[PDB]
Amino acid sequence: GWPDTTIPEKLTPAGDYAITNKSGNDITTAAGYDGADVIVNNTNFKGMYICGSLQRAWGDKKISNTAFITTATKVDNAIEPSNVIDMTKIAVYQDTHVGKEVQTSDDTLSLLGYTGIGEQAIGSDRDRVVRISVLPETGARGGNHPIFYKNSIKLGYVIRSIDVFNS
């Protein structure tokens, strides 16, 4: 059940949500959202997901928090998009309350949302799609053409949704 969409870019997930209209502002309401030249998403976990994260462990109070996951290659404090998924490319950004010691945090996660506001669809940039090695693909045939099945999805900090493509 692990999903398939990389981050757009290198980014250091370190903080909270933030989106700004006009590249000159910050806005936290609907009329400001729609009342927007453009949307910018000055956030550090932009193209990510919203799984539930029961976040258990041995001897660890400070109740579960939310997670954020993609595929990406991790370099010592950050991530970069790779789309060729292997056992190393997995990614998380949940605070499991780790002080100065290994944690051994078992976890469970259920696909539940997205973060990349400003985007307007998913499954349209094939270059960002996670394939192991090969990507199944077709083109028109006869005079028939392929299709997708649209499917709305959550977004996180903002009440709106966004449109998925599905085969």
Binding site: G15, A18, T20, S23, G24, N77, A78, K100
Partner: protein, 201 residues
């Protein structure tokens, strides 16, 4: 101006985000500046990171982020922001604390005492980030904050500065002999228990 998380707490080398949410502007300009006690520096200027920190620090006018940190980076940050020319203005301040756990602290034991006289026990530590409090032991067990109570200890007497270690047998008793230790911790990481030492009454 507006923020979301001033009391940031991080280990060393690990990230940060410093939100500076502003509103109501047309052609803003952003100003970050470092501050800790006597030290002061500019992190940003005109929506542009200063060369002293750009090699590791990023930018975004919702707030900035450090690709990595050191204890020196601890201090106070202030996202001063203005409209073009001060037609409108705001501010906000953020203060930080990198989390270096404490180390094996230095101890201070007069190993011998005169009875009815006064002895002083102190402990001392360097890597307090935040400052690592001290909690004293005797004979392995832990000494109270006040000896008053059903402690088996109220017969003796002392006074503490548990954050500092200033423990005083005011006065000493023949009963007071034992094996004492300071237990260092800043509420982060493991508590660094120190060397244990006798106190000959």
């Amino acid at each position: 101006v507006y923020t979301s998380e001033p009391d940031v707490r991080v280990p060393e080398d690990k990230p940060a985000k410093l939100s500076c949410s502003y509103s109501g502007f047309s052609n803003p300009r952003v100003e970050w500046k470092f501050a800790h006690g006597d030290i002061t520096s500019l992190v940003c200027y005109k929506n542009k990171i200063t060369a002293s920190y750009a090699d590791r620090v990023t930018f975004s006018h919702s707030g900035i982020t450090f690709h990595s940190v050191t204890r020196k980076d601890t201090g106070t940050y202030t996202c001063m922001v203005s409209d073009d020319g001060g037609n409108t203005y705001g501010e906000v301040s953020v203060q930080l604390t990198v989390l270096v756990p404490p180390s094996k602290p230095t101890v201070h034991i007069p190993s011998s005492a005169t009875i009815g006289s006064r002895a002083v026990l102190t402990c001392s530590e360097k890597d307090g980030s935040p400052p690592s409090e001290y909690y004293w032991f005797k004979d392995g067990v832990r000494m109270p904050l006040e000896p008053k109570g059903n402690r088996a200890f109220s017969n003796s007497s002392y006074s503490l500065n548990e954050k500092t270690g200033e423990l005083v047998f005011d006065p000493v008793s023949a009963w007071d002999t034992g094996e004492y230790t300071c237990e260092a911790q800043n509420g982060y990481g493991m508590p660094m228990r120190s060397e244990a030492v006798r106190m000959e009454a």
